[PDB]
Design a binder for this molecule. Structure first.
Ligand SMILES: O=C1CN2Cc3c(ccc(Cl)c3Cl)N=C2N1
Ligand SMILES: O=C1CN2Cc3c(ccc(Cl)c3Cl)N=C2N1
Ligand SMILES: [Mg+2]
Ligand SMILES: [Mg+2]
Ligand SMILES: [Mg+2]
Ligand SMILES: [Mg+2]
Ligand SMILES: [Zn+2]
Ligand SMILES: [Zn+2]
Lengths: 567, 372, 567, 372
């Protein structure tokens, strides 16, 4: 399986896909097709699970001995899978081999123009084309399910009337449908006879010259049942050949009942999801016909009729994954369709609209940003006004006591052009997490370069606090990308400090000189991170004092609070 | 009995000063002291000059005597307070006139009327008169002239707090602006000699009244961020500005007068300092009254603990900043090319904001030094 | 080519794709691959041109002698093309063989959740995957172009800094990029040497063991140039083999200049579309290297370096068609990107919002529809109040004179459960068309069943008025589907009447007993047709009096006019 | 000097008639004639009964004497006109009370207060009191009680046409509703014995005043389709109705009082006929005045050429129709199951609409016969 590697110093979800061969020539000349398919499937499961739940990193042990990636590449099956799950590969993926490990860094999935909110390896909703039963891609499945959810069902025009059309010899698909309807009730079939009709959007034909035929039906039937029930219903005949010569399959009695039993079991196992008031079942019906050559029974021809359905019909559960807490799971059907059908709330009051739309930033100065404001404009004596210590009361009080803290913050904030750190009594509880009381305070430095850092301060010379800080940084990264709507690659770095009285030093940990990321994770944008942090705190209902925008002028003018369902 | 007019209509000692009226930094207080400050007929004179410039005394056949009657009655109507007085209204009238009849780089024009001078020679310079009919501009000017009429000297939130009769009477929803428009129009319709709209149509006068009242109601500071967000969403992702729309023209005039009423921190340093002195005096008056009624004194409104620079910096950053940004990003701010473009207004704004940031920084530094 | 058949009695655009073979076995055993590809391409061009411009009908002469379609089907190449251009085939297409002609009825393209506003056979915007240069589908091309139009360019992070990362032996794609960068400036190549690098998202390698090599480069180069310029730039080496052994191609001098000339011509012919202020060109550069074996020149290796571009780069014009007036044309590049980038206006005032949202119609009565109202509730003496003669003043005046008209309308409106005909002085001018003064009036019967009919009345015993009426019905159908937003299949039938004084009869034409449509075109919905007609008239600025909603109550209450930029 | 109260607070001859107050077709005119029609204290009595039912005289400790003082002063405030009088206000108060405290099939409830009886036994029946706190409902009831106060007898469009002082005073933007709320609240704050909100908090009273004024301003017929479209878009594609939202609860009370003020065509035939008689009489008065001032007479407002059935059919089709549709599609209309669901209100509506369609058809048929 796929296990969340809890033994990494990365501030991210790491998934361990087991051993994995790599390289185009090493994959091509791999003499085990089932193993290769299984490895490709494991990597694709990992990548979908990462995309659906914030970011993440996939760690694969290189199976071949001497692997380079600089004269070997990755492969071609994996590249096909990658290019299928995503539209653009360079925008989401980064590959980096770390000695004897191949790491794939995965950006988090973002809402785009397509409208999709989660990625799926396969919807498993088949649709019947003119002739072939194909599987709905992501976009077609979205469109299908949303049209159905709109009408609270699936609109049909059950036989109220045959339209009064002119009399004229004309040929249409309903001709084939009707000829199948007459074929279906025939009580006997003459062996090696011709057919009057071919296969179309309502008619399918299968040879299946198989001695067993049951292991084959058990795996091929549900996709055709879904293809039919998802469009107009239809018939599926077995025992014919390509040249439309009825032959049937050589089946003796005492097996036709077994075959029918397996068919009923298979079609009752297929999932289904209703948007209508009642909740029907898949109305269908099987039948068998003799193929008597001249006076004797040569065999049978199993004819199955499937009626058009009122809501969607799956062949299996939708192929969509996600890591909940650990042990990456598969999205249930109900959750999957809620992600495919519902919209995002997207309230965006007028005050928030202007607070964000300050972030247009055309090729022009566009001064006056509101998310970078402060009353107390005198911190850190030798410096300019280039750092907004935001809470402004938590920071002041934390600077009053813990005298070494202010000096440490000054000696830290020296090499930063422009940034804005945000303190907190504890950031773990501001992200909906378990607080541990030994953590003095926190911070969040968000500068132009140098991706954001989560300082954790404490005065306890017994523990290490690596687990706490890394969990908090991970959760902040995921919350940013999944709720703040930040649409770029991010890493939330870490630093830990000890703060014994009479001494402010001893950085017990520095996550930046411990782990390497691709070249692109090191360039944040610092205004969209602010928008993302604002929206994340708002959506988590923990936005209290960060982003001052002082109200003493608002109270004079008559403008009300920022936003809530409280007035 | 009615406030009729002063004897000679257009006084002429204030010649050669209205000539420097096509400049953004009009020396308004100089004209105030020049004119007899005993009586005060500045608003009427500046209005006559501006309307003669636009030529509206022929574009609508407005009898100049009744015009002067009405506007002198108006300027008499303005109370004698530190900030919201007839000098302020003359300020705002001149501001809207400048903003709508001075060259705007990169504006494509199409009954309309242009400024007297305007120097129409190129195509890369438009003016708002070349996109807005004469009726809309006359409505906008008269809206600016009577937009703070009979100001009590207090704010909306104060009248709502003490439950003043102007607060009950208007249901606590933009008390002051409703009062200004109501009282001004009442005074207009009172006498017969005030009708300087005598040669209008029924529908014309109806539209004029609608536009005037909308314009005056736009200057309610509570509805500021709403207007800014609406003007952002209508210039950002849309087709831009379809000037044939009446909604677009209405919204543009609303934003223009919004920007004009708050224009202290967009002039030279001394003018802005004078306006700030006025506004702080008015807030001090209101706080004085507020401490006497037992109410907890308002922020910034305590002459015994002034935070003037705090107020002005926060104001420039929160109110005039984003408004001028949204007004400029739609490419309407008047400026000039550079043989890329130079805009006087935003430069003045940046300079003043930096100055107040100096005062704040120095004060906090000295206080942290002394008080440890 | 493809010619608009002006010689049909259909109220639609008919396209003539020339002779066309049909049937799966007739296509499979067709011994001319170029001809088969050409026929498939002609049919696909016709179908895209129909989808992009309202509805239409494709008429194909059956090429094989004895063709049935009821025991032959269509084919498989055509089915593949069909299923590619559309998501769902049964929703848009109907196939009907009419003796010696195969007619394909095409619904009009509709805005769906995907966001696409026009269909394209191929965007011709290639993207570079991990290894292969693929062509952007419709959705990826939409996303790409919209992201670019948003930022008014295409955002890059030109070398401001190499991030301060730890020192550790690590392998990444930039290794291959740098090794290519050192390969590119090498002044000479030793024949039959090994390579240190393989092909990735920045590196491509081609063998091309071709004696000419120029006819091949001329056709293969532009797609790789586009794949590179549309993602990160890169290098393209020719003269190598699969096993990474430099061999080069045996080229003598006096041809390398020709090859470079053809390359420059080819890359300058490739279209491009900028969303940035400046308008650069495709910055690139070629080069040739010797492959000297031991002391002699064996050949060359043409190395081409392509730099990442600021806006989109096509291999050819986008493959999108449309019929303008006749002679179905291809959408220009500018029009194509305007259809891919811009949105629809979608004003929808509050009054219109409620006038439409009356059309929810859950499983419940939901009486009170506003688009079916009338003051004068007494027409056609023997009848109920079940027909809304809408203009109410044009209809009254037209009934005053032309006495036989009212009797004719009564004898016509007898067999209709519930409908609403809409008169007009002339419907041709209400759709932006040329009026002919011999047409007395018009009408538009929109009932539940019986798809809408366009009665044309006149009193002139010389002409026929078939051309006028059919043009008007065609234009009304197209306007409905393309502007009213009606999302189902429609046909606008026709009827013509002669109205000499003292006699009201002589229906000179009845389009319903002249042409056959599929079984589904005969069931309209009659409330969405009303919404569509309302929106079409609004968008055409001809909505004057139809849909009464009398204002005498509105004027009392204080509500204003329906909608316009006039108040 | 102030309108204080009548001597015994709760008169008791109108017992056994308020018992039939849990029925939608409350025989209001029967109670009117029962009560002394000489003076008129119906509004106060029905208000006392409803507030005792909800128990708000313990849910907020409202002193009943000052309550009766205020509401008797209110009912004295209502002018004596054909339609908009104190009987109409009692109608609307009872309508909102019924709509919010009677069983609603398929409503999931969660300080709150329920009706006196209500028979709470199942889960498939909710009531709007089980989703809205007591403060919001008290605000809604008092909003309904004083919502047509001091009605001049004319419409908004008439006051805007003749430029009445109530039109100038409020800038021609919902003149009548602003007047109603303003005058009512003024009268409330005038005396000290009217404060039946004496045991409230500062914030509580502020919220109460805000909700009352919003509710009264919701009944402006010009803003009808806007409210309908907003309530459609907030029940159709959204998550439904998140009752924890204050915006949702506010919008629901606004729609509820919108539906209550127009409820003539939702009762039995005789009640609706009486209300229609009243409204036609009032329109006839207004048209009488309008023909005398030289103005072209208004549609439907000519007693010499009545089009009563035209008016009532168009009204039921355009105004009350879509409103009741939007109110019902959100599953809030009170009704009962069928052992699918039976709703008395929409049935009455359909019956009356059919009746007026009969009258229109017959009249047009006879006129076309006679006049050829
Ligand atoms: O130069 C200036 C002019 N003004 C006006 C002003 C303000 C703060 C509040 C209000 Cl309400 C107003 Cl009108 N500050 C400044 N500063
Ligand atoms: O039964 C009834 C009650 N009402 C009220 C009403 C109306 C038409 C206009 C207005 Cl403004 C009003 Cl309040 N029609 C009817 N009919
Ligand atoms: Mg003001
Ligand atoms: Mg002002
Ligand atoms: Mg009212
Ligand atoms: Mg009322
Ligand atoms: Zn279903
Ligand atoms: Zn470009």
């Amino acid at each position: 399986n796929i296990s969340v590697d809890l033994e990494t110093n990365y501030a991210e979800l790491v998934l361990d896909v087991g051993r994995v061969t790599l390289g185009e020539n090493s994959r091509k000349k791999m003499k085990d097709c089932k193993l290769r398919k299984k490895q490709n499937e494991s990597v694709s499961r990992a990548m979908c699970a990462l995309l659906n739940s914030g970011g993440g990193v996939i760690k694969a042990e290189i199976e071949n001995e001497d692997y380079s990636y600089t004269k070997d590449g990755i492969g071609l099956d994996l590249e096909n899978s990658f290019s299928n799950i995503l539209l653009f590969v360079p925008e989401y993926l980064d590959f980096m081999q770390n000695g004897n490990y191949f790491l794939i860094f995965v950006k988090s999935w973002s809402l785009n123009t397509s409208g999709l909110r989660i990625t799926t390896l396969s919807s498993n909703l088949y649709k019947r084309d003119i002739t072939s039963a194909k599987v709905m891609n992501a976009t077609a499945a979205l469109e299908f399910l949303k049209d159905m959810k709109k009408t609270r069902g699936r609109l049909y025009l059950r036989p109220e009337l045959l339209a009064k059309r002119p009399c004229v010899d004309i040929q249409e698909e309903n001709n084939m449908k009707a000829l199948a309807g007459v074929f279906f009730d025939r009580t006997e079939l003459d062996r090696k006879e011709k057919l009057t009709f071919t296969e179309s959007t309502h008619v399918e034909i299968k040879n299946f010259s198989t001695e067993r035929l049951l292991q084959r039906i058990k795996e091929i039937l549900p996709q055709y049942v879904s293809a039919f029930a998802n469009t107009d219903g239809g018939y599926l005949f077995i025992g014919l050949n390509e040249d439309k010569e009825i032959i049937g399959f050589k089946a003796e009695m005492s097996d036709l009942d077994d075959l029918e039993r397996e068919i009923e079991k298979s079609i009752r196992k297929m999932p289904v999801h209703h948007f209508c008031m009642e909740k029907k079942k898949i109305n269908y019906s099987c039948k068998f016909l003799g193929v008597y050559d001249k006076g004797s029974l040569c065999g049978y021809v199993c004819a199955l009729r499937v009626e058009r359905f009122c809501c969607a019909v799956f062949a299996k559960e939708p192929d969509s994954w996600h890591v909940k807490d650990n042990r990456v799971m598969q999205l249930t059907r109900k959750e999957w369709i809620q992600f495919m059908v519902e919209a995002e709330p997207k309230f965006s009051s007028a005050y928030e609209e202007v607070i964000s739309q300050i972030n247009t930033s055309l090729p022009a100065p566009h001064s006056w940003p509101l998310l970078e404001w402060q009353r107390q404009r005198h911190h850190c004596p030798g410096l300019s006004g280039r750092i907004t210590y935001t809470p402004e009361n938590l920071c002041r009080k934390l600077f009053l006591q813990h005298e070494g803290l202010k000096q440490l913050i000054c000696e830290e904030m020296s090499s930063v052009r422009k940034g804005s750190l945000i303190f907190s009594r504890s950031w773990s509880v501001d992200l909906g997490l378990q607080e541990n009381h030994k953590v003095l305070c926190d911070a969040l430095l968000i500068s132009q370069d140098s991706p954001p850092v989560l300082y954790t301060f404490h005065m306890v010379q017994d523990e290490e606090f690596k687990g706490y800080s890394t969990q908090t940084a991970l959760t902040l990264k995921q919350k940013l990308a999944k709720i703040g709507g930040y649409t770029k690659k991010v890493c939330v770095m870490t630093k830990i400090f000890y703060l014994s009285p009479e001494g402010m030093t001893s950085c017990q940990y520095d996550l930046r000189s411990q782990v390497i990321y691709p070249e692109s994770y090191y360039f944040t944008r610092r205004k969209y991170l602010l928008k993302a942090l604002f929206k994340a705190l708002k959506r988590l209902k923990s936005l209290r004092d960060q982003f001052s925008f002082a109200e003493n002028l608002y109270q004079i003018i008559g403008i009300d609070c920022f936003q809530k369902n409280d007035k | 009995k009615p406030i009729l007019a002063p004897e000679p209509l257009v006084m002429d000692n204030l010649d050669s000063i209205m000539e420097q009226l096509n400049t953004w930094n009009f020396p308004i207080f100089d004209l105030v002291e020049n004119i007899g400050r005993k009586c005060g007929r500045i608003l009427s004179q500046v209005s006559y000059r501006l309307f003669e410039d636009m030529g509206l005394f022929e574009a609508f056949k407005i009898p100049i005597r009744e015009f002067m009657n009405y506007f002198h009655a108006l300027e008499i109507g303005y109370r004698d307070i530190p900030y919201h007085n007839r000098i302020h209204a003359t300020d705002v009238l001149h501001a809207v006139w400048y903003l709508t009849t001075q060259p705007i780089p990169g504006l494509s024009t199409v009954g309309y009327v242009f400024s007297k001078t305007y120097n129409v020679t190129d195509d890369k310079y438009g003016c708002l008169s070349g996109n807005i009919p004469a009726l809309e501009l006359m409505a906008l000017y008269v809206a600016a002239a009577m937009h703070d009429y009979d100001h009590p000297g207090r704010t909306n939130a104060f009248l709502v707090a003490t439950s003043a009769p102007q607060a009950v009477l208007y249901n606590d929803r933009s008390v002051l602006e409703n009062h200004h428009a109501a009282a001004a129009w009442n005074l207009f319709m009172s006498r017969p000699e005030y009708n300087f709209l005598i040669n209008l149509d029924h529908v014309e006068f109806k539209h004029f009244r609608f536009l005037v009242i909308e314009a005056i109601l736009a200057t309610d500071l509570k509805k500021h961020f709403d207007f800014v967000a609406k003007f952002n969403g209508k210039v950002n992702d849309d087709v831009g500005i379809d000037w044939t729309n009446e909604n677009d023209r209405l919204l543009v005039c609303q934003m223009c007068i919004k920007l004009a009423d708050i224009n202290g921190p967009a002039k030279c340093k001394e003018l802005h300092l004078q306006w700030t002195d006025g506004i702080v005096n008015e807030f001090y008056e209101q706080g004085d009254e507020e401490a006497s009624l037992g109410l907890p004194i308002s922020p910034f409104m305590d002459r015994s603990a002034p935070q003037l620079a705090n107020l002005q910096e926060s104001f420039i950053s929160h109110i005039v900043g984003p408004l001028c940004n949204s007004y400029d990003s739609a490419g309407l701010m008047p400026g000039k090319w550079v043989e890329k473009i130079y805009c006087q207004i935003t430069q003045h704004l940046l300079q003043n904001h930096k100055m107040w940031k100096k005062v704040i920084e120095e004060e906090q530094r000295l206080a942290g030094i002394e008080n440890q």
